[PDB]
Each structure stands twice: as C-alpha cells, then as structure tokens.
C-alpha cells in the first residue's frame, strides 16, 4: 500500500552497462598483386597497406562498437605463388610509423622483422608494433588510429609473371564501448602527386597523376572527400572565366591501357546519400595552377 | 641444406582459424512514441517491434561477423514519462512468434510475461523466448532469424499527451564465424494493406495505405525491394495504355497532416549503388487493380 | 532402429580452368551441398525424406604441372542462404585453405549437424548444411583440372520415394536482368552472375520463381506484354563461355520446351525484369 | 613534486528548454570537456600546459514542476572526435542515464585518465577526455531549466601562462553550407547543424579552418570571387532561434569585425562552400 504521487519515478535500470571488452582475432589477406614480366623493376613498390581494423574485414565490423583497440599480436605472411625458375627478388617489412612515406629497400631492412627473398620462396615477417591503445574512429593524427603499414618492394626484375599474396595474421583487443558510424571508421589517404589544371579533362582526371598506391587500386563508384578545396575554372558562356569550388571526388575503374583509372569531381549530398557531378571544366588560356598539392588527404565518405 | 624444388610449398599457416564465439550484451531503446490526447483509443497498436540484432544497434554490428546468434537473456522495460493524472492504460507483451500479426489485448495477456498498467506507471516484461540458435543473415523463413516481437497497445483513452519509451535489455551469444554483408542483415517487413491502382499519384503513393507500423515510421531516402512485382500503367503518348514492371520503392518523410508519408517507386541499380525514379503513372479508364496484395514482403536493400 | 547410417567419399565436382583464363576472385566451383551432388549418397537420399550430416571434409585435388604457379582459396560457407563468393568471406570461415594450384589441401568445415530434408523446399536452410566455394587467387599459368572430393558420413531417417527433379539445389541469380539487355530471342547467361547456371549443361531447363515479362509486337507498331516462367540453357563456347538462355514454355508432362515470343523494344522506360535473388530450380530430368 | 592536484564541483552548463519546444532527439546540451568549461578549473588550467583527469562525474539537476512528464537521456562520450549525438550512440556509452525531467541523475563515465594539454591543438584527442551530451526523450510539457554539474578532480603538471582565447574548445560543423543557402549578407546558423554554435552568444567571433568563398559583383553583370575566414554570430530570437552568421574580417590586433562583401548569385553551378567537419574556433575574447 503506497500512495499515489504526482509523478512516479524512473525504473530504467540496466542502462549504460554494456559489454565492455572483446579479444578477437583471425587472419586476413591484406593485398594481392600480379606483376607481368617487364614490370617489377628494382624498387617497384608492389604493396603499401596502412593497417587499420577496416583493412582486416572481420575486425573492422567489431570496431564499430568500441572506441579503442590495442594490438596484441601481428605477423604477416608473404606467400607468392610462382615456380622455382623466376629469378626475381622481393623485400618486405612493417613500418611502425603509419605516416612514413619513403619506401626504399634500405628503409625496410632497417625495420625489425624485415625479410628478403627470391620470388619463389614464402616468408614470415614478425614485426615490431605499438601494443598501446589506438582509436577505432579516424582522427586528425594518424599516429593514433594505426600501428604502422606493411610495404613490399621488388628487388630484381622478374623474368615471369609474379602472383604475390600478402596475408596478415592478427589478434587484437577492443577496449571501449560506443557506437561508431561506418563513415568515420575509414582510413585517410595522402596523395604523393601534384594535380595541375593543365593536366585535366572537361569532367574527370587520371588517378595515376595523384601517385598514390591506394587511390590507384581503389574501387568503382567510390565517393571521396578532401581536406583542401579543389579549384575548377568554369564559364558563364560569354568567353567568361569564372571560378568554382568543389570538395568531393568519384572513382571510376581503370584499364589494361590505363592501370589506375579516372576521378570525376562533384558534390556528395550527405543528407540524402547521393552524388551530383561537377560542372564542365573551362579549357582556357589560364595560367598554370596546382589545384591540389602533394599531400592532400582524401577520406572516404560514402556508405560502407 | 635443402635442394631447389620445381616449386616450394605453401606456408599459409594460421588460416581459417578465426575467433569463434562472443557473448555480448547491453540495453537498447527499441522504440519511442508520443501520443496526443485524442489518439490512443482502446487497442491502438502504439508499438510493434520485431526483434533482430539489427534493431539492437551495438549487437547488430557484431552480428555481421558471425552466422548464428542465440538469445541468452531478454527483458523489456516500458517507462512512459507522464504525470499521475493521465488516466489511460496500456498493455505490453512479447509475442514469441515473429510472424504473428494479430495484436489484441487478449492475445498479449495470453503471452507469458505480459503486463497491464496505467500510463503513469513503469513496467518490466520478462518474456518467454526461444533460447535456440537463430541466424544473423535474413532468410526466407522468419521463424529462424527472430525470436518474436514486442507489441504495446493502448487500453483506454489518454486524457493527455503520452510519452512512452520502450527499452530492451538483452544478452546474446554469437555462434558462427563468417562475414555477412549489411544488405542481407536487415529484417523483412510484411504489409497489412492492399495497394489499389485507383489509390495512386503520377509518381508516388501514401505509406499509411500499406497499413504497416514499420513502413509508416520508416526513415527518409530509404530504398526498399519487394518479392512481388509492381504493375505500373504507363503510356507511349498516343492515348496508348502500356504496361511497366518495377520491383523497388523509395521512402519520403511524412507530415503532421500526413503521419506516415510517401513512397516513390523506381529502380535500385545495385552494381553502382544509385536509385533511378519510376515512369509517369498513366491515369486512365482502366479496371480497378490490386498492384500489391496484403502480405507483400518488403526487404531493405540500400547501404546500412 | 529405423535410422540408417551411410558413409563414403565422392567427387562433389570437377572443373577445368584453362590456360590463362581466371584471375584473382574467379569462382571455379560453387557447390551447394545437398545429397544429390554427392554421388553415392545421391541414391540413398532418394529413399528417405530426412538426412543429417555426421561428418564432412573436402579434399581439394588439383591436377596440373608442378610449374603452374597460380593459386586458390577454398572453404565451406555454412549458410546455404549466403550468396557472397568473395575471398574475404571465404577467409572468414573455419576450415578455409590456401595453396598453389599443384597442391591438394583439405578443408575442414564446421556444419549444422542437425536434421535436414532431402527434397528441396522454400527455406533452404533445412535442405543444406552450407556450400563450398573455391576461387582463384592468382592468374593460372596452365590448364588446371581440379577435382574436389568430399568424404562424408550421414544419417538418413524416414523411408520415402523421392522425385529426382525435386532433389536438386535451387540456384540464385547474382545479377539483375535488365530489359535493355535482351536480344530478340535470348540473352547472355553471364548477366545473371551465377556460376552454377553458367556451367549448367546445354539443354538444362529452369523454372523461375519470378515472372519473366517479354514485351512483343504484332508488327503494327503495337506493343503487347507476354509472361514466361521457364528458361533453356544453350551451351557456351569459346566466344561466349557463359552461353545463352531462351525464354519459353516448359511442358511438364511431355518434358519439352517451346521457345517464346520475340522481344520488341520500342521506346520503353528503364525496367528491372529479374531482380537479384531470383530463384531458378532445375525442373528437367537429368 | 612539481605537480598540483585540484578538485571541485562546478556547473558545466545550463540550458533552459522552454515549454513545448523540444522533441525526442533534440540536443539540449553538448559540451566538449576541457578545463575552460569547468569554472574553477578554468583558472587553474591557464597556468599550466598539461592536465590529467583523476575523477569525473556529472550530476544532472533539472528544474521543473513535478508534473512535467517529459524525459531526457544523458551520457558521456569518450571521443572528443566523435560527432554523433543520437540516443543510440549515447545509450551505448558507460554511465548513460535516462529519467523524467523532474529527476536528477548522476552519470558515471569512463574517461581517458591520461595526460592532456590545456591549450587547443590540431588533434583534439590530446586536449579532451570526451564530451557530454544530454538529449530529449519526449516532448517536454513545461519549461525546464536544466543545470548540469560536474564534480571533477584533476592533476595539473607544468607551469605556464596561457592565452585564454586559445584554451577554448573547437566547434565542428554538422551540416554543409551550400551557396544557394546564403542570403545577401548572412545565413542562418541552423544550417551548420551545431548546438554549441547555435547557442554561442551574440557577437561571438569564429575563425574557420576552411575558406568561405563569396561570389560578388561590381554591379556590371560581372561575377568575381572573394574569400573570408571569420564569422560573427548575430543572436537568435523567437522567430529564428538559431540566429545568423555574417562573414567578414576579424582584425586580431584591434579585436574588431568588419562585415564582408554582399553575395551575388548569378546562374552559378551547385557548390559546397563549408563541408561537414569544418572547424570553428572561438578567437574573440570572452
Ligand atoms: Ca570513436
Ligand atoms: Ca549468414
Ligand atoms: Ca521429401
Ligand atoms: Ca599550452
């Protein structure tokens, strides 16, 4: 027998008490290449993979529920498929800084774990990694969301086709409970090539021009966004030179003739999840202009 | 000292040995309503939520890595916010069949756990559930992907605005290791209202017409797909009656005047992730036609 | 007891992937596991309605020269419903293996181990424990003639006589058929995106669970609409390895196909005819 | 030792959400936790560069009549970077609470507990342990004047003198500014989707990390382009509760704003001016 109050009180009991930790692990292919005989000149950077949960598929999904993750174990396997008579050499190693962009044989052998071997032999690279707790959501500083990157370079000239596959065996612990939308979980990518407005087409441009191993082998229909604005020289149609400012790109698949592919600029309307295309570039007697400089950061924004 | 073979052998060691089980749990709001005074007539089905990992947000993400899940514990809390002088009553209960569509007070009280209470009191519904292992990927039979659904009905007429919130406290074990794309993890939805071709507009139609509590409170820009084809009567433009066949819809948000909203038919191009709109419906002296019958299953296909 | 245990080793399937064809990802066998596919068990199943899997292993068995230098990934996906052939999906499964084309390997899956039906039905999670997919991981240098063997043991439960056209696995489309992809009388099998359909022999007949609408004309500038439920496979060759499908009428009594009406395209609006996830049972006898 | 421990209880913020305004989801306080926001700690932080959090709890404290019958959800999100105010996001955090508007509650978060900086910097995961968001869960019947209190203890490490305009939390845009949303001289604050900006007082000045391009004309039918880096908040009222922003020039020496050029729209192609994730620091003194 209790009295009738003005208002009863809340009985929302179990709240805010979600599962906290998960250890989780597996083995994931982190890249695959195929090199035709002539290609594979000394030093050709066959692979460069920045490690982030997202790259390890199974992990990538779990990481959308917690805010931190910390690496407990990593190894990579190299496992090219090729017969004994191939006379080329590779060198792999895990660079513990995810920002480091200089890929030389010399800079890998320097890394702990680094391996060197003729194409017909497999190899295991037991690297050195942070084992501290990084973040699952991408951020401004990369040093905090990734433990480093795995690169593999050619060492001689392959006599024949090389079918390399590079597997990463991982185990990791997810620390903090939270809900992270799949847009923010993507890894940022730095260009290593200047985009001139003399090197253009009316509505697109080459992906090899940007000089980035990820953006080169990036998939189709894939909407990106940039930190730096893109300057498009358009016209009213009186011979008039006007100026347009777009922030977003769209990847189109490449060719056997054009290894890397295209990139159509435009507008990524996020409220409605759609992608408009960008205005007709006005070819003109306009002074030469770098529209996007070396080091432009491109972060994937569309639904994954 | 080993000899040089024709081909060395594979050294892909740790493969196919991923993490297998995860227990995981939390508490999630499963719906929220607000009922203005007049609304809330006896029996008004205020809530009807089919339970699936996806509905429990944190869980929904983990479920994309395993193939089965099995429920270890469930309770729901009811927790309306309203002051003591509101004189209306509700009745909640968890229907252990996810297909059961008859929502009567009588059919809830029948369920184990079911509760009855005036709006100003909170309640906990400790239900009966399968505790067997269901599947995370949606399938043809629903009985196998969901343990049932939680419905809440009005019991009198609310004198005042009712702000109910319904929280589900869950704990579940994910059984089987695998990678499931977010398109297949969505829950299917059955319409409970016939769509006549007399009740139409040139390019859209009402969402209340379908008579489905989910499709009514479904979000904006949300592309669906159907099991049954949709028959659109179009024209060549000579007074000609031609026939068109579309499989896909698009949700547009609703009004204070139109509670539920619109639905624009069309084409969901999945290769490229885009949505074209459907042709101008030809209004004509055409015999009355049910385009989509009661019980049409609508499964969400766009990126989540 | 009334239950019958049966065990054996049997070839699930055999592909030849010729020289140079095939590239990372190329699905070289995609086999939905049901007793019909397992030869000796095939006949045992025709007798009872229900089977349950006791043991399952696949032994991969590829045949090529030692210098072949390609590669494959194999594994067993437990969801006969899951329709995702990517490497990533496979590498996620238990059992999964990777090797060079000259190396046999044994995949050791995990499977339902519960009581399933012999004859096909709506929900195919009760007809099958899963499916095995084997993919290319590189480009194969040589002709490889891969023969995937399955060692199996099972328990068969209630005696029955089973119609053999019913025992077969339903095949699902992976790609949409658009109206603007139809030729006058046929279309390319590859459009449907399905390896089992692409490799189904010449003259296979399939029933669809969704209507195939064919716009046609009398030749008066007048567009009319027809409906069809059956396809006939016309074999693929070097020029068109996927082959072709003609729509038409399957007569179930006489077991004969009659080709349907010609497609007439006349300024029609864009249309989806056969959405992805269209189900295609083999109805013709084998 | 050189390190200084300091503890107190302080009001993080105070909102009034008036009668009938506010609906499930409506963010009523979104406060990025940095020492400036915590009053007494505010001054302590101006002296050292580095602080570390020892204890943190927020006590919610809403004030209304007992018959108010709305509701709120509160919680503390550990990622100053994470920009997601939904209930689902909050309910996922540790500490999270729910109550009727007349009930105080105490959120008990989990936080970084590591060594952070006092002055703002590029990566704001080193300036803050996270942010607290409190949302509506129903429609509030009455005026509620919620005052959220924080009991805190901290360790301050290296002595320093700190510029107070630098100590402030950067605010991030949640919505894009489109060119076709500009008025001649201003635009509506609500377009940027940010509660802290929407409630920033009249006359607040903000610097952007991205250029605001303004197309203008001389009045000859000739379109020209200007660039601006500063905004001034013009206070919101009942008709436009979010208020408005004028672009222009902030003079950092004289601490004065000069309004910029008028926007001229003349058959321009669709453009994104300020994409979502544009960063907006408070530069004007307080
Ligand atoms: Ca985060
Ligand atoms: Ca599945
Ligand atoms: Ca049977
Ligand atoms: Ca400082």
**The pair of three-digit structure tokens given for residue C276, joined into one six-digit string:** 């992805």
- Name A28's bridge partners: A168
Q: Which residues fall within 8 angstroms of residue C40, CB to CB, at 6 or more apart?
A: C6, C8, C10
Q: How far is Cα of residue A55 from the mean position of the Cα atoms in its chain?
A: 8
**What is the per-residue DSSP string for A206-266?**
ESTTTT-HHHHTPPTT-EEEEEEEEEEEE--SSS--EEEEEEEEEEE---SSSSS-EE--E
> Is D123's CB within 8 Å of A135's CB?
no
> Which of B4, B7, B12, B64 is the best mutation test for A, with the most CBs of A within 10 A?
B12
- Residue D85, sorted as left (phi over 0), alpha (psi -120 to 50) or beta, turns out to be alpha
Query: Cα dist. D115→A279, D50, D58, D160, D231 in Å?
Result: 48, 7, 21, 16, 33
Q: What is the CA radius of gyration of chain A?
A: 24
Minimum-distance CB partner of A27 among B17, B61, B169: B17
Helix (H, G, I), strand (E, B) or coil at C104: coil
> Is A81's CB within 8 Å of C69's CB?
yes
Query: Cα dist. D217→D229, D260, D263 in Å?
Result: 20, 13, 8
Is D49 annotated as belonging to a binding site? Answer: yes
Minimum-distance CB partner of B83 among D23, D67, D137: D67
Could you tell me how many residues make up chain D? 286
> Is A65's CB within 8 Å of B58's CB?
yes
In this complex, the chains that touch C, judged by 3 or more CB pairs closer than 8 A, are A, B
> Is A165's CB within 8 Å of C137's CB?
yes
In terms of C-beta density within 10 A (0-12 exposed, 13-18 middle, 19 or more buried), how is residue C101 classed? buried
**The pair of three-digit structure tokens given for residue C229, joined into one six-digit string:** 């439920």
DSSP classification of residue B104: -
Residue with tokens 């204070």: B256
Shortest Cα–Cα distance, A269 to chain D (Å): 9
**The pair of three-digit structure tokens given for residue B150, joined into one six-digit string:** 């939680």
- A106, A133 contact by CB (below 8 A): no
Which residues of chain A have a CB within 8 Å of the CB of C74?
none
Instruction: Residue D88: name the closest of D73, D71, D110 by CA.
Output: D73
Determine the number of helices (DSSP H) and then strands (DSSP E) in chain D: 4, 18
Distance between CA atoms of residues C96 and A288, nearest Å: 54
Instruction: Residue B181: name the closest of D172, C85, A294, A108 by CA.
Output: C85
Helix (H, G, I), strand (E, B) or coil at A55: helix
Distance between CA atoms of residues B140 and B156, nearest Å: 38
**The pair of three-digit structure tokens given for residue C76, joined into one six-digit string:** 């067993």
Query: Cα dist. B193→B187, B190, B294, B296, C30 in Å?
Result: 19, 9, 5, 9, 40
Instruction: Residue B276: name the closest of B262, B285, B261, B264 by CA.
Output: B264
- C171, C196 contact by CB (below 8 A): yes
Residue with tokens 């923010």: A184
Element (H, E) at C154: strand C144-156
Minimum-distance CB partner of C137 among A26, A32, A84: A32
- Give the Cα-Cα-Cα angle B130, B131, B134 (nearest 5 degrees): 80
Q: Closest residue of B to D138, CA-based? A: B163
Instruction: Residue A213: name the closest of A235, A245, A194, A191 by CA.
Output: A191
Distance between CA atoms of residues C33 and C57, nearest Å: 12
Residue with tokens 């060691």: B13
Q: Using CA of residue B68, residue C129, residue C11, residue C234, what is the dihedral sign?
A: negative
Query: Cα dist. C21→A56, C69, C143, C235 in Å?
Result: 29, 14, 9, 18
Instruction: Residue C103: name the closest of B140, A299, B9, A125 by CA.
Output: B9
- Name C26's bridge partners: none
- Provide the H-helix boundaries in A13-166: 57-62, 105-109
Distance between CA atoms of residues C219 and B220, nearest Å: 45
Which residues of chain B have a CB within 8 Å of the CB of A22?
22, 24
Distance between CA atoms of residues B112 and B123, nearest Å: 14
Instruction: Residue B196: name the closest of B280, B102, B281 by CA.
Output: B281
Helix (H, G, I), strand (E, B) or coil at B196: strand
In terms of C-beta density within 10 A (0-12 exposed, 13-18 middle, 19 or more buried), how is residue A13 classed? middle
- B48, C125 contact by CB (below 8 A): no
Residue with tokens 């699902």: C172
Q: A27: how many CB neighbours lie within 10 A of its CB?
A: 26
Distance between CA atoms of residues C123 and C128, nearest Å: 10
Residue with tokens 């995961």: D125
**The pair of three-digit structure tokens given for residue C227, joined into one six-digit string:** 């409906």
Which residues of chain B have a CB within 8 Å of the CB of D66?
83
Could you give phi then psi for residue C84, rounded to 5 degrees?
Answer: -115, 100
Instruction: Residue B293: name the closest of B205, B145, B193, B226 by CA.
Output: B193
Minimum-distance CB partner of D125 among A17, A139, A242: A139
Instruction: Residue B35: name the closest of B143, B192, B163, B149 by CA.
Output: B163
Q: Which residues fall within 8 angstroms of residue A38, CB to CB, at 6 or more apart?
A: A157
Closest ligand to the CA of B174: 2
Determine the number of helices (DSSP H) and then strands (DSSP E) in chain A: 3, 19
Instruction: Residue B188: name the closest of B280, B289, B98 by CA.
Output: B98
Instruction: Residue A129: name the closest of A146, A115, A154 by CA.
Output: A146
**What is the per-residue DSSP string for B224-292?**
EEEEEEEEEEE--SSS--EEEEEEEEEEE---SSSSS-EE--EEEETTTTEEEEPP-----S----EEE
Distance between CA atoms of residues D16 and D10, nearest Å: 18
> Is C67's CB within 8 Å of B17's CB?
no
Instruction: Residue C280: name the closest of C200, C179, C216, C214 by CA.
Output: C200
Residue with tokens 């779990």: A62
Q: How far is Cα of residue A303 from the mean position of the Cα atoms in its chain?
A: 15
- D75, D107 contact by CB (below 8 A): yes
Distance between CA atoms of residues B279 and B232, nearest Å: 8
Instruction: Residue D152: name the closest of D37, D8, D44, D40 by CA.
Output: D8
- A113, A126 contact by CB (below 8 A): yes
**What is the per-residue DSSP string for A170-201?**
EEEEE--B----TTTTSPPEE--S-EESSS--
Is C259 annotated as belonging to a binding site? Answer: no
Shortest Cα–Cα distance, A36 to chain D (Å): 42
Distance between CA atoms of residues A264 and A248, nearest Å: 9
Buried b (16+ CB within 10 A) or exposed e, A215-250: bebbeeebbbbbbbbbbbbbbeeeeeebebbbbbbb
Q: What is the CA radius of gyration of chain C?
A: 20
**The pair of three-digit structure tokens given for residue D61, joined into one six-digit string:** 């404290």
In this complex, the chains that touch D, judged by 3 or more CB pairs closer than 8 A, are A, B
Which residues of chain B have a CB within 8 Å of the CB of C79?
67, 135, 137, 178
Distance from the alpha carbon of residue B143 to the mean position of ligand 1, in angstroms? 35
Distance between CA atoms of residues D277 and D29, nearest Å: 19
Distance between CA atoms of residues B166 and B146, nearest Å: 18
Q: What share of chain A is helix, strand, coil (3-state, %, to 5)?
A: 5, 35, 55
Query: Cα dist. A110→A79, A100, C279 in Å?
Result: 22, 13, 56
> Is C82's CB within 8 Å of B65's CB?
no
Distance between CA atoms of residues D67 and B81, nearest Å: 10
β-pairing, C205-217 with C279-282? antiparallel
Distance from the alpha carbon of residue C162 to the mean position of ligand 3, in angstroms? 6
β-pairing, C144-156 with C4-17? antiparallel
- Give the Cα-Cα-Cα angle A279, A281, A282 (nearest 5 degrees): 125
> Is A7's CB within 8 Å of D175's CB?
no
Distance between CA atoms of residues B97 and B75, nearest Å: 16
- Give the Cα-Cα-Cα angle D272, D274, D279 (nearest 5 degrees): 155
> Is D123's CB within 8 Å of A144's CB?
yes
**The pair of three-digit structure tokens given for residue D248, joined into one six-digit string:** 């222009």
Q: Which residues fall within 8 angstroms of residue C219, CB to CB, at 6 or more apart?
A: none
> Is D275's CB within 8 Å of A225's CB?
yes
Query: Cα dist. C126→A103, A136, C42, C44, D256 in Å?
Result: 53, 39, 17, 18, 75
Distance between CA atoms of residues D274 and D206, nearest Å: 14
**The pair of three-digit structure tokens given for residue C37, joined into one six-digit string:** 């596919």
Q: B155: how many CB neighbours lie within 10 A of its CB?
A: 19
- Name D99's bridge partners: D72
- A78, A94 contact by CB (below 8 A): no
Distance between CA atoms of residues B31 and B155, nearest Å: 18
> Is A16's CB within 8 Å of B5's CB?
no
> Is D69's CB within 8 Å of A242's CB?
no
- A288, A197 contact by CB (below 8 A): yes
Closest ligand to the CA of A178: 1
- Give the Cα-Cα-Cα angle A88, A92, A96 (nearest 5 degrees): 165
Distance between CA atoms of residues A236 and A239, nearest Å: 7
Which residues of chain C have a CB within 8 Å of the CB of A81?
69-71, 100-101, 137-138
Q: What is the CA radius of gyration of chain D?
A: 20
Distance between CA atoms of residues B256 and B265, nearest Å: 23
**The pair of three-digit structure tokens given for residue A18, joined into one six-digit string:** 């979600």
Listed in order, strand segments (DSSP E) in chain D are: 4-17, 27-32, 50-59, 72-77, 97-99, 106-107, 115-117, 131-136, 144-156, 171-172, 177-178, 187-188, 205-217, 223-234, 244-251, 256-259, 272-274, 279-282
- Name D147's bridge partners: D14
- D239, D214 contact by CB (below 8 A): no
**What is the per-residue DSSP string for B106-154?**
HHHHTSTT-EEEETTS--EE------SEEESS--S-GGGT---EEEEEE
DSSP classification of residue A283: -
Q: Which residues fall within 8 angstroms of residue B90, CB to CB, at 6 or more apart?
A: B46, B78, B80, B116, B117, B118, B119, B152, B153, B154, B155, B164
Residue with tokens 């424990």: C129
Q: Which residues fall within 8 angstroms of residue C262, CB to CB, at 6 or more apart?
A: C184, C185, C216
> What distance, in Å, lies between the first and last C-alpha atoms of chain B?
55
Could you tell me how many residues make up chain C? 286
Shortest Cα–Cα distance, B79 to chain C (Å): 38
- Name D7's bridge partners: D153
Distance between CA atoms of residues B35 and D201, nearest Å: 35
> Is A25's CB within 8 Å of B7's CB?
no
Query: Cα dist. D109→D11, D91, D99, D113 in Å?
Result: 17, 12, 17, 11
- D191, D177 contact by CB (below 8 A): yes
Is C222 annotated as belonging to a binding site? Answer: yes
> Is C100's CB within 8 Å of A81's CB?
yes
In this complex, the chains that touch A, judged by 3 or more CB pairs closer than 8 A, are B, C, D
**The pair of three-digit structure tokens given for residue D252, joined into one six-digit string:** 């950092």
Q: Which residues fall within 8 angstroms of residue B274, CB to CB, at 6 or more apart?
A: A274, B268
**The pair of three-digit structure tokens given for residue A238, joined into one six-digit string:** 């009186």
Q: Using CA of residue B55, residue B57, residue B58, residue B64, what is the dihedral sign?
A: positive
Distance from the alpha carbon of residue D167 to the mean position of ligand 4, in angstroms? 8
* Way it was determined: X-ray
Q: Which residues fall within 8 angstroms of residue B287, CB to CB, at 6 or more apart?
A: none
Shortest Cα–Cα distance, D278 to chain A (Å): 9
Which residues of A lie closer than 8 Å to D, measured between beta carbons? 5-7, 9-10, 12, 15-18, 20, 65, 67, 135, 137-141, 144, 176-181, 184, 225, 229, 234, 236, 240, 242-248, 267, 270-271, 276, 278-279
- A134, A174 contact by CB (below 8 A): no
β-pairing, B115-118 with B149-154? unpaired
- Provide the H-helix boundaries in C36-181: 39-45, 87-91, 164-167
Residue with tokens 């903090």: A176
Touch of C by A (3+ CB pairs closer than 8 Å): yes
Residue with tokens 């792999």: A92
- Name C184's bridge partners: none
Which residues of A lie closer than 8 Å to C, measured between beta carbons? 26-29, 32, 34, 57-58, 79, 81-85, 160-161, 163, 165, 167
- Name C259's bridge partners: C248
Shortest Cα–Cα distance, A226 to chain D (Å): 9
- Residue C90, sorted as left (phi over 0), alpha (psi -120 to 50) or beta, turns out to be alpha
> Is C98's CB within 8 Å of A83's CB?
no
Shortest Cα–Cα distance, B6 to chain C (Å): 6
CA dihedral of residues A209, A211, A217, A223 (deg, nearest 10): -70
Q: B193: how many CB neighbours lie within 10 A of its CB?
A: 18
Resolution, rounded to a tenth of an Å?
Answer: 3.6
Residue with tokens 């400036």: D36
Distance from the alpha carbon of residue B127 to the mean position of ligand 4, in angstroms? 56
Element (H, E) at C73: strand C72-77
**What is the per-residue DSSP string for B59-98?**
HHHHTTTBSEEEEEEEEEE---B--S----EEEEEEES-S
- C272, B267 contact by CB (below 8 A): yes
Q: D114: how many CB neighbours lie within 10 A of its CB?
A: 10
Distance between CA atoms of residues B154 and B152, nearest Å: 7
Distance between CA atoms of residues B76 and B151, nearest Å: 11
In terms of C-beta density within 10 A (0-12 exposed, 13-18 middle, 19 or more buried), how is residue D2 classed? exposed
């Amino acid at each position: 027998r209790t009295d009738a109050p003005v208002s009863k009180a809340s009985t929302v009991t179990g709240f805010g008490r979600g599962t906290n930790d998960v250890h989780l692990s597996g083995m994931s292919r982190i890249s695959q290449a195929v090199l035709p005989a002539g290609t594979g000149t000394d030093g050709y950077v066959v692979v460069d993979a920045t490690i982030v949960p997202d790259l390890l598929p199974r992990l990538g999904h779990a990481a959308r529920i917690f805010q931190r993750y910390a690496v407990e174990t990593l190894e990579f396997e190299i496992q090219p498929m090729c017969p004994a008579n191939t006379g080329g050499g590779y060198v792999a190693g895990f660079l513990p800084d995810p920002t480091d962009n200089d890929h030389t044989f010399d800079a890998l052998q320097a890394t702990r774990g680094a391996v060197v071997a003729k194409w017909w032999e497999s190899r295991t690279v037991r690297p050195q990694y942070t084992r501290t707790l990084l973040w699952t959501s991408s951020g401004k500083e990369q040093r905090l969301t990734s433990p480093g990157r795995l690169i593999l370079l050619c060492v001689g000239n392959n006599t024949d086709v090389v079918n390399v596959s590079v597997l990463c065996r991982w185990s990791v612990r997810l620390s903090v409970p939270s809900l992270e939308n799949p847009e923010e979980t993507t890894a940022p990518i730095m260009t290593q090539g200047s985009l001139y407005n003399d090197s253009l087409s009316t509505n697109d441009f080459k992906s090899i021009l940007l000089g980035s191993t990820p953006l080169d082998i990036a998939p189709d229909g894939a909407v990106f966004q940039l930190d730096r604005p893109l300057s498009i020289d358009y016209s009213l149609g009186t011979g008039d030179v006007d100026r347009a400012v777009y922030w977003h790109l769209k990847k189109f698949a490449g060719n056997a003739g054009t290894p890397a592919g295209w990139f159509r600029w435009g507008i990524w309307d996020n409220f409605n999840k759609t992608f408009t295309d960008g205005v007709a570039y006005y070819s003109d007697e306009q002074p030469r202009q770098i529209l996007l400089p070396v080091g432009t950061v491109c972060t994937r924004v569309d639904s994954e």
